[PDB]
PDB file of C-alpha atoms in Angstrom:
ATOM      1  CA  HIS A 708     -58.984 -73.281  66.233  1.00 38.18           C
ATOM      2  CA  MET A 709     -56.958 -73.073  63.018  1.00 36.18           C
ATOM      3  CA  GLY A 710     -56.226 -76.441  61.501  1.00 37.93           C
ATOM      4  CA  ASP A 711     -54.778 -77.470  58.166  1.00 41.41           C
ATOM      5  CA  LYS A 712     -56.610 -78.639  55.085  1.00 39.84           C
ATOM      6  CA  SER A 713     -56.276 -82.365  54.611  1.00 35.86           C
ATOM      7  CA  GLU A 714     -55.311 -83.044  51.012  1.00 38.54           C
ATOM      8  CA  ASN A 715     -56.786 -86.040  49.265  1.00 38.78           C
ATOM      9  CA  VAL A 716     -54.896 -88.493  47.109  1.00 38.16           C
ATOM     10  CA  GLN A 717     -55.417 -87.560  43.473  1.00 38.06           C
ATOM     11  CA  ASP A 718     -53.194 -89.974  41.543  1.00 39.27           C
ATOM     12  CA  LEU A 719     -54.547 -92.633  39.209  1.00 39.16           C
ATOM     13  CA  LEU A 720     -53.454 -95.563  37.073  1.00 38.52           C
ATOM     14  CA  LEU A 721     -52.928 -95.030  33.375  1.00 39.18           C
ATOM     15  CA  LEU A 722     -52.220 -97.329  30.459  1.00 43.57           C
ATOM     16  CA  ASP A 723     -48.724 -98.587  29.671  1.00 40.81           C
ATOM     17  CA  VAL A 724     -49.255 -98.427  25.929  1.00 43.25           C
ATOM     18  CA  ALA A 725     -51.195 -96.025  23.739  1.00 42.33           C
ATOM     19  CA  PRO A 726     -54.691 -97.566  23.250  1.00 38.49           C
ATOM     20  CA  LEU A 727     -55.205 -95.164  20.382  1.00 38.36           C
ATOM     21  CA  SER A 728     -53.228 -93.108  17.926  1.00 39.05           C
ATOM     22  CA  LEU A 729     -52.486 -89.486  18.777  1.00 39.06           C
ATOM     23  CA  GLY A 730     -51.695 -86.928  16.137  1.00 40.55           C
ATOM     24  CA  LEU A 731     -52.976 -84.184  13.893  1.00 44.66           C
ATOM     25  CA  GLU A 732     -55.751 -84.081  11.350  1.00 40.31           C
ATOM     26  CA  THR A 733     -54.710 -83.065   7.884  1.00 38.36           C
ATOM     27  CA  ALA A 734     -56.762 -80.631   5.769  1.00 39.35           C
ATOM     28  CA  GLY A 735     -59.676 -82.792   4.772  1.00 42.60           C
ATOM     29  CA  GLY A 736     -60.577 -84.383   8.069  1.00 42.58           C
ATOM     30  CA  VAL A 737     -58.138 -87.256   7.767  1.00 44.84           C
ATOM     31  CA  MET A 738     -56.320 -88.354  10.926  1.00 44.29           C
ATOM     32  CA  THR A 739     -52.567 -88.220  10.649  1.00 45.07           C
ATOM     33  CA  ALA A 740     -51.151 -90.331  13.454  1.00 44.16           C
ATOM     34  CA  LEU A 741     -47.990 -89.011  15.037  1.00 40.61           C
ATOM     35  CA  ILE A 742     -47.968 -91.449  17.917  1.00 37.09           C
ATOM     36  CA  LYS A 743     -49.407 -94.688  16.599  1.00 33.25           C
ATOM     37  CA  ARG A 744     -51.403 -97.179  18.622  1.00 35.91           C
ATOM     38  CA  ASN A 745     -49.691 -99.972  20.646  1.00 36.80           C
ATOM     39  CA  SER A 746     -46.729 -97.751  21.434  1.00 33.99           C
ATOM     40  CA  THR A 747     -45.210 -97.759  24.912  1.00 33.03           C
ATOM     41  CA  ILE A 748     -46.056 -94.606  26.805  1.00 35.51           C
ATOM     42  CA  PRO A 749     -44.885 -92.222  27.931  1.00 34.36           C
ATOM     43  CA  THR A 750     -43.253 -91.661  24.573  1.00 32.05           C
ATOM     44  CA  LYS A 751     -42.078 -88.707  22.526  1.00 30.61           C
ATOM     45  CA  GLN A 752     -42.441 -88.759  18.781  1.00 34.76           C
ATOM     46  CA  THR A 753     -41.705 -86.053  16.265  1.00 34.77           C
ATOM     47  CA  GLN A 754     -43.036 -85.795  12.731  1.00 33.03           C
ATOM     48  CA  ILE A 755     -42.782 -83.257   9.970  1.00 31.69           C
ATOM     49  CA  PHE A 756     -45.904 -81.410   8.868  1.00 31.81           C
ATOM     50  CA  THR A 757     -46.621 -78.695   6.355  1.00 30.72           C
ATOM     51  CA  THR A 758     -49.206 -75.944   6.111  1.00 31.90           C
ATOM     52  CA  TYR A 759     -51.772 -74.749   3.601  1.00 33.88           C
ATOM     53  CA  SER A 760     -53.007 -71.181   3.694  1.00 31.26           C
ATOM     54  CA  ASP A 761     -55.813 -69.304   1.973  1.00 31.88           C
ATOM     55  CA  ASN A 762     -54.385 -65.793   1.631  1.00 30.97           C
ATOM     56  CA  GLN A 763     -52.451 -65.277   4.858  1.00 32.48           C
ATOM     57  CA  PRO A 764     -49.810 -67.796   6.059  1.00 29.49           C
ATOM     58  CA  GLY A 765     -51.233 -69.149   9.292  1.00 30.45           C
ATOM     59  CA  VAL A 766     -50.381 -72.435  10.934  1.00 30.44           C
ATOM     60  CA  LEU A 767     -52.867 -74.186  13.174  1.00 27.87           C
ATOM     61  CA  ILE A 768     -52.180 -77.514  14.821  1.00 28.54           C
ATOM     62  CA  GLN A 769     -55.267 -79.694  15.043  1.00 26.21           C
ATOM     63  CA  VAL A 770     -54.643 -82.365  17.665  1.00 27.60           C
ATOM     64  CA  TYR A 771     -56.977 -85.345  17.492  1.00 30.66           C
ATOM     65  CA  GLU A 772     -57.555 -88.284  19.830  1.00 29.66           C
ATOM     66  CA  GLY A 773     -57.891 -91.663  18.177  1.00 27.20           C
ATOM     67  CA  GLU A 774     -57.252 -93.267  14.831  1.00 29.87           C
ATOM     68  CA  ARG A 775     -60.077 -92.135  12.596  1.00 30.87           C
ATOM     69  CA  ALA A 776     -59.875 -91.237   8.890  1.00 32.47           C
ATOM     70  CA  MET A 777     -63.244 -89.576   9.485  1.00 30.55           C
ATOM     71  CA  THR A 778     -61.986 -86.974  12.014  1.00 28.02           C
ATOM     72  CA  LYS A 779     -64.420 -84.417  10.468  1.00 30.74           C
ATOM     73  CA  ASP A 780     -67.269 -86.536  11.888  1.00 30.01           C
ATOM     74  CA  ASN A 781     -65.656 -86.553  15.312  1.00 30.68           C
ATOM     75  CA  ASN A 782     -64.719 -84.059  18.005  1.00 32.41           C
ATOM     76  CA  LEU A 783     -61.256 -82.483  18.035  1.00 29.34           C
ATOM     77  CA  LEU A 784     -58.925 -82.930  21.026  1.00 30.35           C
ATOM     78  CA  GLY A 785     -56.938 -79.703  20.993  1.00 32.72           C
ATOM     79  CA  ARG A 786     -55.683 -76.922  18.749  1.00 33.37           C
ATOM     80  CA  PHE A 787     -53.028 -74.236  18.953  1.00 35.40           C
ATOM     81  CA  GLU A 788     -52.074 -71.614  16.407  1.00 33.05           C
ATOM     82  CA  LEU A 789     -48.561 -70.550  15.470  1.00 32.33           C
ATOM     83  CA  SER A 790     -48.025 -66.841  15.015  1.00 31.71           C
ATOM     84  CA  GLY A 791     -45.379 -64.223  15.569  1.00 31.83           C
ATOM     85  CA  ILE A 792     -43.208 -65.222  12.653  1.00 30.53           C
ATOM     86  CA  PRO A 793     -40.869 -62.339  11.640  1.00 28.90           C
ATOM     87  CA  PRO A 794     -39.763 -63.826   8.203  1.00 32.19           C
ATOM     88  CA  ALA A 795     -42.176 -64.466   5.363  1.00 33.09           C
ATOM     89  CA  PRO A 796     -43.435 -68.101   5.337  1.00 35.04           C
ATOM     90  CA  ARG A 797     -43.243 -69.351   1.753  1.00 35.36           C
ATOM     91  CA  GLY A 798     -44.556 -72.806   2.542  1.00 38.67           C
ATOM     92  CA  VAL A 799     -41.120 -74.280   1.960  1.00 37.25           C
ATOM     93  CA  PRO A 800     -39.885 -74.541   5.629  1.00 38.80           C
ATOM     94  CA  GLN A 801     -41.723 -77.413   7.260  1.00 36.64           C
ATOM     95  CA  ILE A 802     -43.300 -77.391  10.699  1.00 36.08           C
ATOM     96  CA  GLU A 803     -41.867 -79.812  13.220  1.00 34.63           C
ATOM     97  CA  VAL A 804     -44.473 -81.161  15.613  1.00 34.03           C
ATOM     98  CA  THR A 805     -43.389 -83.092  18.687  1.00 32.57           C
ATOM     99  CA  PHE A 806     -45.729 -85.098  20.928  1.00 29.80           C
ATOM    100  CA  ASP A 807     -44.179 -85.702  24.339  1.00 30.39           C
ATOM    101  CA  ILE A 808     -46.252 -87.705  26.791  1.00 30.94           C
ATOM    102  CA  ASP A 809     -45.605 -87.391  30.519  1.00 27.77           C
ATOM    103  CA  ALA A 810     -46.073 -90.196  33.093  1.00 25.14           C
ATOM    104  CA  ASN A 811     -48.442 -87.970  35.076  1.00 25.95           C
ATOM    105  CA  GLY A 812     -50.955 -88.260  32.255  1.00 30.32           C
ATOM    106  CA  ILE A 813     -50.477 -85.076  30.270  1.00 30.66           C
ATOM    107  CA  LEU A 814     -49.650 -84.700  26.602  1.00 30.19           C
ATOM    108  CA  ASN A 815     -47.165 -81.927  25.963  1.00 29.36           C
ATOM    109  CA  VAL A 816     -47.253 -81.094  22.307  1.00 25.49           C
ATOM    110  CA  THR A 817     -44.708 -78.702  20.918  1.00 23.98           C
ATOM    111  CA  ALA A 818     -44.606 -77.305  17.418  1.00 24.02           C
ATOM    112  CA  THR A 819     -41.420 -75.748  16.158  1.00 23.48           C
ATOM    113  CA  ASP A 820     -41.522 -73.206  13.358  1.00 22.93           C
ATOM    114  CA  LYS A 821     -38.444 -74.100  11.322  1.00 24.69           C
ATOM    115  CA  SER A 822     -39.085 -70.901   9.402  1.00 26.24           C
ATOM    116  CA  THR A 823     -38.066 -68.642  12.295  1.00 23.93           C
ATOM    117  CA  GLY A 824     -36.895 -70.962  15.083  1.00 26.84           C
ATOM    118  CA  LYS A 825     -39.948 -70.514  17.281  1.00 28.27           C
ATOM    119  CA  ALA A 826     -41.620 -73.145  19.461  1.00 27.15           C
ATOM    120  CA  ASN A 827     -45.109 -73.179  20.965  1.00 25.01           C
ATOM    121  CA  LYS A 828     -46.617 -75.743  23.323  1.00 24.72           C
ATOM    122  CA  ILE A 829     -49.789 -76.685  25.179  1.00 25.76           C
ATOM    123  CA  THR A 830     -50.427 -79.210  27.924  1.00 22.64           C
ATOM    124  CA  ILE A 831     -53.375 -81.340  26.872  1.00 23.57           C
ATOM    125  CA  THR A 832     -54.853 -83.585  29.526  1.00 23.36           C
ATOM    126  CA  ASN A 833     -57.187 -86.338  28.385  1.00 24.94           C
ATOM    127  CA  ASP A 834     -56.364 -88.823  31.189  1.00 21.50           C
ATOM    128  CA  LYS A 835     -58.358 -91.729  29.797  1.00 23.78           C
ATOM    129  CA  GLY A 836     -59.703 -90.027  26.710  1.00 22.95           C
ATOM    130  CA  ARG A 837     -62.574 -87.714  25.884  1.00 22.72           C
ATOM    131  CA  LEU A 838     -64.686 -90.287  24.076  1.00 23.97           C
ATOM    132  CA  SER A 839     -66.817 -92.883  25.846  1.00 23.87           C
ATOM    133  CA  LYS A 840     -65.183 -96.233  26.711  1.00 18.67           C
ATOM    134  CA  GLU A 841     -67.637 -97.956  24.367  1.00 18.22           C
ATOM    135  CA  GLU A 842     -66.586 -95.604  21.573  1.00 19.41           C
ATOM    136  CA  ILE A 843     -62.929 -96.302  22.312  1.00 15.93           C
ATOM    137  CA  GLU A 844     -63.577 -99.858  21.139  1.00 14.95           C
ATOM    138  CA  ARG A 845     -64.932 -98.586  17.813  1.00 14.17           C
ATOM    139  CA  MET A 846     -61.921 -96.296  17.515  1.00 16.58           C
ATOM    140  CA  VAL A 847     -59.738 -99.401  17.773  1.00 16.12           C
ATOM    141  CA  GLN A 848     -61.814-101.984  15.888  1.00 11.61           C
ATOM    142  CA  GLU A 849     -62.882 -99.662  13.087  1.00 12.09           C
ATOM    143  CA  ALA A 850     -59.373 -98.192  12.836  1.00 14.87           C
ATOM    144  CA  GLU A 851     -58.471-101.034  10.463  1.00 14.46           C
ATOM    145  CA  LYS A 852     -61.433-100.422   8.129  1.00 16.59           C
ATOM    146  CA  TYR A 853     -60.742 -96.698   7.986  1.00 15.91           C
ATOM    147  CA  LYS A 854     -57.117 -97.601   7.329  1.00 16.02           C
ATOM    148  CA  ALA A 855     -58.250 -98.799   3.907  1.00 18.71           C
ATOM    149  CA  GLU A 856     -60.134 -95.555   3.272  1.00 23.49           C
ATOM    150  CA  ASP A 857     -57.228 -93.476   4.635  1.00 27.65           C
ATOM    151  CA  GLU A 858     -54.785 -94.246   1.812  1.00 28.72           C
ATOM    152  CA  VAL A 859     -57.522 -93.517  -0.708  1.00 29.24           C
ATOM    153  CA  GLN A 860     -58.919 -90.236   0.590  1.00 30.40           C
ATOM    154  CA  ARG A 861     -55.392 -89.148   1.621  1.00 32.32           C
ATOM    155  CA  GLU A 862     -54.362 -88.685  -2.007  1.00 28.48           C
ATOM    156  CA  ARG A 863     -57.824 -87.636  -3.169  1.00 29.61           C
ATOM    157  CA  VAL A 864     -57.804 -84.696  -0.779  1.00 30.30           C
ATOM    158  CA  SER A 865     -54.107 -84.159  -1.653  1.00 28.60           C
ATOM    159  CA  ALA A 866     -53.192 -83.677   1.990  1.00 28.37           C
ATOM    160  CA  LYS A 867     -50.554 -85.989   3.399  1.00 32.29           C
ATOM    161  CA  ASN A 868     -49.463 -83.782   6.287  1.00 28.97           C
ATOM    162  CA  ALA A 869     -50.909 -80.416   5.334  1.00 29.60           C
ATOM    163  CA  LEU A 870     -52.263 -78.425   8.248  1.00 30.10           C
ATOM    164  CA  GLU A 871     -54.921 -75.837   7.528  1.00 28.51           C
ATOM    165  CA  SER A 872     -54.943 -72.285   8.910  1.00 29.84           C
ATOM    166  CA  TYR A 873     -58.366 -72.667  10.454  1.00 30.30           C
ATOM    167  CA  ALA A 874     -60.183 -75.900  11.069  1.00 30.44           C
ATOM    168  CA  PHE A 875     -63.907 -75.581  11.511  1.00 31.87           C
ATOM    169  CA  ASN A 876     -64.962 -78.472  13.704  1.00 36.20           C
ATOM    170  CA  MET A 877     -68.718 -78.637  13.515  1.00 32.27           C
ATOM    171  CA  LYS A 878     -70.250 -79.424  16.872  1.00 28.89           C
ATOM    172  CA  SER A 879     -72.160 -82.452  15.722  1.00 27.10           C
ATOM    173  CA  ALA A 880     -74.100 -83.651  18.731  1.00 28.89           C
ATOM    174  CA  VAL A 881     -74.346 -87.419  18.948  1.00 28.45           C
ATOM    175  CA  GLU A 882     -77.923 -88.621  18.893  1.00 26.93           C
ATOM    176  CA  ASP A 883     -79.280 -91.162  21.347  1.00 22.59           C
ATOM    177  CA  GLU A 884     -79.912 -94.497  19.672  1.00 24.68           C
ATOM    178  CA  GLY A 885     -83.650 -94.386  19.199  1.00 24.90           C
ATOM    179  CA  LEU A 886     -83.651 -96.689  16.226  1.00 24.12           C
ATOM    180  CA  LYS A 887     -85.683 -99.607  17.476  1.00 26.21           C
ATOM    181  CA  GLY A 888     -84.672-102.505  15.292  1.00 25.52           C
ATOM    182  CA  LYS A 889     -85.400-106.209  15.203  1.00 27.53           C
ATOM    183  CA  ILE A 890     -83.862-109.370  13.785  1.00 27.00           C
ATOM    184  CA  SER A 891     -85.574-111.574  11.225  1.00 27.09           C
ATOM    185  CA  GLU A 892     -86.021-115.324  11.208  1.00 23.99           C
TER     186      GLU A 892
END
């Protein structure tokens, strides 16, 4: 009368290398790759980032999926704020951000406040990505053209690795291609 619930198999195959670059967007909407593309995963990389504040020192980690110097035109992957810092952040102590990928398919990011010795994490699961497979191709192919823009806008915005306190990602809804074109002879 009382049986057991048959569990289904829920594993899946992932990629061996990172098809895209994972990292943080710097104040300005420019993608700052922490884990670059073509890297063997799972992998754990750590890079040093800084923070820019308006009036109150607040650190927010904007995690983005893909290599895109136009991150402000795209949708953010994840974001976690760092708070609970006893000492006064003067902008001098840098923020250490570590991206540790697990074989199960989860991205465990961990930011360490070198100002107080605190560490915060969040398990982000994208599996195969949030963007469409067709868009993944653009994220790879166009990554080289935005690479040229990157070095330019990087200095123009004056943000190499500066994380902003609050990133306002506008929910720009992608429009369905209704532009009926035609080739000419």
